[PDB]
Design a binder for these strands. Sequence first.
RNA 1: CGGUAAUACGGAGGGCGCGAGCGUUACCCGGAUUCACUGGGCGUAAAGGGCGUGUAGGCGGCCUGGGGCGUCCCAUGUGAAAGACCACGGCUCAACCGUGGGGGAGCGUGGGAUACGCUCAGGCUAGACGGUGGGAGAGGGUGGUGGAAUUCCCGGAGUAGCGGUGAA
RNA 2: AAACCGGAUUAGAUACCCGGGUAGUCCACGCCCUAAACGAUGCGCGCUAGGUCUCUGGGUCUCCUGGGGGCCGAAGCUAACGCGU
Lengths: 138, 234
Amino acid sequence: MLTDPIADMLTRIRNATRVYKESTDVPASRFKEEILRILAREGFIKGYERVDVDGKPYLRVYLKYGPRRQGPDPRPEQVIHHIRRISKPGRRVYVGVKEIPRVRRGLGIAILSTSKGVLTDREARKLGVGGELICEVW
Amino acid sequence: VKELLEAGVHFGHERKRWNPKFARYIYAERNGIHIIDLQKTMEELERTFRFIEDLAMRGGTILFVGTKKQAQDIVRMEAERAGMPYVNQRWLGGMLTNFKTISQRVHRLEELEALFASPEIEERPKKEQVRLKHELERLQKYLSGFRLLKRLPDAIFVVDPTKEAIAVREARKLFIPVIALADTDSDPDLVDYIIPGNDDAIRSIQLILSRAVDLIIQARGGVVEPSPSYALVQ
RNA sequence: CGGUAAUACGGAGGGCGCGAGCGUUACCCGGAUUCACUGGGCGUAAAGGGCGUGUAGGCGGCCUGGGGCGUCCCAUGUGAAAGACCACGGCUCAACCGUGGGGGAGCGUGGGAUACGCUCAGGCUAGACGGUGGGAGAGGGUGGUGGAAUUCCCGGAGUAGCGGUGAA
RNA sequence: AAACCGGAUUAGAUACCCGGGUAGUCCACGCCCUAAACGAUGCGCGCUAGGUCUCUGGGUCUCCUGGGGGCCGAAGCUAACGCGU
Ligand SMILES: [Mg+2]
Ligand SMILES: [Mg+2]
C-alpha cells in the first residue's frame, strides 16, 4: 500500500541524486509539501512544484549538486549528502525542546514537526517547542 | 566553414550499442539508427574550440590519439601538420602515467638515430645489424609521434574514447583535460570537452580533426591549404 | 616456553614498576557494537519457518472538519537528610568535617498548542476488490482409452548353446 | 530391488562386478510429517541505467506496451565469491 509516505519521499530523493537526476516526482501530500518547503529554503533542493501525471497530483522536486569535479570520477559532490528517517510507523520518535538534536554541529538540519507547524531545529528551538523528529539531513 | 558542412556526411552513427549517458546528445532512432542532434554538436564545438584556442595560443601541447583502424593516418597528418605529438599504432600501458620510464624508450630510440649516421656507419658484429636495427624497427613504429612530447601534454585529443579508454583513464588520473570526438558508443561524463560526433566515418574524423588543427596553427598565425589529407579517402 | 648454547625453567649480576606495602585468588562493571534502544545480524561464516491459509496482534493512501488520548509548551506542587557536583570555610595539609549554591528525570494540579500519531464525522479514487471481453499452461480430482517394451503362457518353425565379464 | 541366497574379486571383501530374490516399488483407504523440503535467499509495497535471448497477452505490429523465464552486467552493495528492475 506504501506504508510510510514520508520515508518514501526521502528515499525517492536519496535515490534520484545518486544517479544525478535533474528532478523526481513524488506523489503529493500537504505534509510532503511542508517538508519540501524546508528543503528548498535551507538550500538543499533548487525547488519544487505541483504537477500532474496520469492526472494525479505529484510534486516535481528539482535537485541541486556541486560543480563537475577534479580527476578520475568527475561526479559532482552532492548537496544532499545524507537524508534519513528518524521517526517511523514502527517506532514514533518525539523530543522535548531541551532535547532536540544538533545535526553535524549545525552544518546540517533536522526537520521536525510541531503543533506550531513543521520546522528546522533552530526554528523550533527559537519558538521553544518540540515534537515528532521527522528526519535528519546533511 | 561549418554548419551544414557537418550534415555533409558526418552526423549520427552507431545503433543499440549505446551508452544511455549519451542520451542528452541524441536526436532520434530514425530508421533503426541513433542520429545525433547537431545543433548541440555545434554547441559543444564552440566551447571546445574555445578551449583549444586559448590552450594553443597560450602555447600549449595537445596530444592526439587515434589508434583506430580508419583514423590511423588522418591523425599523423593533422598532428604533424601542427607539430603536435600523436599516438598512432597502439596506446601503451602508461605513456602518461608511467611517463618517465616509457620515455627512456625515446631517450634510447634516438641513440639509434645516432648509430645510423655513425662511426659504426657499416660496423658491429654483423648479426647485430638485425638485433639492433630491428630494435630501432619497433621503436620507430610506435614512438614516432610520441617522441616530440618531453613533458605531459596540457591536453589530449581522442577520436574514440570507448576505443581509447586506457588513455583517457590516464589523462583523468593525471588531471590532464580530455578533448575528444565521441559518439553513442561513449560515456560523456569523463570527456571534459566533448565533440559529440561520429567516431567512425573517415570524412567525419577529417572535417573535424583538421579544423581543430586550423585553429591551432591559426592561433599562432599562418593558415594553410585544404590540408595534406584526403588519404585514399574512399 | 623446556629434546645440550633457553633474554620464557632455577640461580646470579644487572634492569623495569610500585612502595609500608607489593602480589595472588574470588567476585562486579569495562573493553564486549559479543543480546546491538543508543548500537548487530541470517546466499556460501551461526541464523528464513518445508509451503500455505489466515486468529489475536503490529502496521496503514489522499482531502476536510470536530475532539485533544498520545505528543509539545507555560505555571505550579512534589522530588527529606546524607551522598554527588561548585564555591568558601575548620582540623598545620589531606583524608574527614562545616556552611552556602546549583542541578534533577518521574509523578500531581492549573492553563495553553494541534503539525504528526490516535479517535469521531464527512469526502476522493492513485492501494485492494469486483464487471465485461479475450488468453497461455505437465495446476488438481474422476472415469475412460492408445501404442512401444519387458515377463510369462499357447502355436509355429528351428539346433546347441545362450547369458554374463576385466577375465570368469 | 534393501534384506537374503549364490558366483567372482580380494591379504580379507559382511562391497564395489555377476546370477537369483522377499519386503517395497503399484492401487484404495487410514497413519507418519521428515529432507541438500535449496535460489541453502520469508511476505508485501515504493524507488534506482541499459543490452541480449525467451514464453505468453495487447497496440497504430521497424517496433511499442503488460506479465513470466534467462544471461551480461549503470549506480550501489559484499569479507570476498558474487548480487545487480
Ligand atoms: Mg554479528
Ligand atoms: Mg549456514
